[PDB]
Design brief:
This is part of a larger assembly, with chains A (160 residues), B (52 residues) and C (66 residues).
Chain A (H helix, E strand, L loop, with lengths): L30 E6 L4 E8 L1 E5 L4 E4 L7 E3 L4 E5 L5 E6 L2 E5 L5 E5 L2 E3 L5 H16 L3 H21 L1
Parallel strand pairs in A: 1-9
Antiparallel strand pairs in A: 1-2, 3-4, 3-6, 5-8, 6-7, 7-10, 8-9
Chain B lengths: L1 H13 L4 H30 L4
Chain C lengths: L8 H15 L4 H7 L10 E2 L4 E2 L14
Antiparallel strand pairs in C: 1-2
The chains are: A alpha+beta (160), B mainly alpha (52), C mainly alpha (66).
């Protein structure tokens, strides 16, 4: 028998993660954002002035040199603000935001769609369905309607 | 006093890079608290050692 | 809420994703995204010579593993 003909590579090594820094003494002027849905990015290390995330504890706002914090993303909207003053809103389905002191943001999600790709007419129909599903006494339907309403209520609040 | 220094640690725990820029405000808050205590004590030391 | 009902965080994410896929407009992006929520997969295991489904972990999201 051949002595270990195979020697597979570790796939983690094919990615390039940031290296965290202690005591660097320099504050970044603008963050380096990286948003990813299921596998594909929509933004790769873009310069960004500011960003605004939603969580279960509440809505947070991140700027350059924000403290290292890792935390959930509650299912809602996500605002990016470039140096030019414009903005870009994205609806998400959960995730984890990884902030850096050096100025790097990895918002890894399961979905990321702009609000422009959503219509209020189609949303209004789903609302009463999720609501009446929450009314039906049954654990299989109540939780599903609760989750659907949880994602829809911020949309109904933001489109207005 | 401690409420100042107690803050500086926690801040430094969350951002070591800023530890060198927060110390002036820390020393300033400490100095003002200490000075208030110093006047409170200066009354008493002035209350006794001169008045008959 | 859904936490003690037994369904995991990931099924909750997938349900929220399915809802976002429902509401969004008709377009190429919806055509790309419906693929990322639809359920087509299975499990299977070999008997002595034949195939058999392992239906203890269901694909449909409303259900709960046991």
């Amino acid at each position: 028998q051949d002595p270990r003909k195979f020697f597979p590579d570790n796939g983690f090594r094919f990615f390039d993660g940031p290296e965290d820094s202690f005591g660097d003494g320099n504050i970044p002027a603008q963050i380096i954002l990286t948003l990813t849905r299921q596998d594909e990015f929509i933004l790769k290390q873009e310069p960004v002035a500011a960003i605004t995330i939603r969580t279960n504890e509440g809505e947070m706002g991140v700027l350059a040199g924000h403290e290292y914090t890792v935390q959930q993303l509650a299912p809602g909207i996500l605002e990016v603000e470039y140096e030019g003053g414009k903005k870009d809103q994205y609806v998400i389905s959960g995730g984890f935001a990884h902030v850096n002191d050096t100025g790097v943001v990895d918002i890894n999600t399961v979905e990321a769609v702009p609000l422009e790709e959503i219509d209020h007419e189609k949303l209004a129909k789903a609302l009463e369905e999720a609501r009446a599903k929450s009314q039906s006494p049954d654990e299989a339907v109540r939780i599903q309607g609760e989750i659907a309403l949880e994602i829809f209520e911020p949309l109904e609040a933001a489109l207005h | 006093v401690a409420m100042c220094f107690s803050s500086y640690m926690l801040a430094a725990a969350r951002q070591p890079n800023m530890s060198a820029k927060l110390l002036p405000y820390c020393i300033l808050g400490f100095a003002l608290s200490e000075a208030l205590a110093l006047f409170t004590l200066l009354i008493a030391l002035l209350e006794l050692f001169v008045f008959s | 809420s859904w936490r003690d009902a037994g369904i995991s965080y990931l099924r909750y994410l997938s349900i929220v994703t399915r809802c976002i896929h429902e509401v969004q407009k008709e377009g190429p992006l919806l055509t790309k995204n419906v693929r990322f929520s639809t359920i087509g997969w299975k499990s299977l295991y070999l008997d002595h010579g034949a195939t058999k489904e392992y239906t203890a972990i269901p694909a449909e999201l409303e259900k709960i593993p046991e």
